[PDB]
């Protein structure tokens, strides 16, 4: 992830 980028699924 990442601060806007995490992936939720």
Do not use: E
Request: net charge neutral.
């Amino acid at each position: 992830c990442y601060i806007q980028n995490c992936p939720l699924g």
